[PDB]
Design a binder for this molecule. Sequence first.
Ligand SMILES: Nc1ncnc2c1ncn2[C@@H]1O[C@H](COP(=O)(O)OP(=O)(O)O)[C@@H](O)[C@H]1O
Ligand SMILES: O=C(O)C1=C[C@@H](O)[C@H](O)[C@H](O)C1
Ligand SMILES: [Cl-]
Length: 165
Amino acid sequence: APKAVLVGLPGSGKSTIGRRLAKALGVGLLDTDVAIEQRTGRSIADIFATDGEQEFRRIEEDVVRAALADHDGVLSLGGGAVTSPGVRAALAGHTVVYLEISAAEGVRRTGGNTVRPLLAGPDRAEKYRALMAKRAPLYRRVATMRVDTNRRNPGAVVRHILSRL
Ligand SMILES: Nc1ncnc2c1ncn2[C@@H]1O[C@H](COP(=O)(O)OP(=O)(O)O)[C@@H](O)[C@H]1O
Ligand SMILES: O=C(O)C1=C[C@@H](O)[C@H](O)[C@H](O)C1
Ligand SMILES: [Cl-]
């Protein structure tokens, strides 16, 4: 089982806090987004564009289930993995760290638009707040630890988690 599974909105720090937390624990980071682009050989954008979200979500879920069983390090989920109920089910019993971020900050953290199909285009503030409205209940539902990352720097978020594992 992972030492911890990080979830939260795009730009909440999953990948960054993931890396740093893995380094601190001396374990591997598995980043499901990364695991998908390797498993498929495609970008996340290319999948969303050629295959659609439903098809991404299915590939994501399979990867997520395997990671949850096979990885003993830090597992960072794609930002919308929690929208799959099979994902949410496979999370039950795990150490799930919900990185919380305000919309204004999240908007700004994602502002060099990392790809992110679902944040792409203009009206990014609006889209980000709508992602938050829909997913926040889902993150809270799967979370065993909620960490506010709003005015905490990545090292402090890492320490807050480490101290609570
Ligand atoms: N606690 C934090 N404080 C400041 N910037 C952060 C923090 N967490 C992440 N970031 C920055 O925000 C950007 C998005 O982080 P990332 O780890 O890619 O988020 P996610 O994996 O959740 O999309 C990165 O440049 C990272 O450097
Ligand atoms: O639905 C989402 O919020 C996301 C999906 C993909 O772009 C990536 O899996 C990412 O981490 C965000
Ligand atoms: Cl994300």
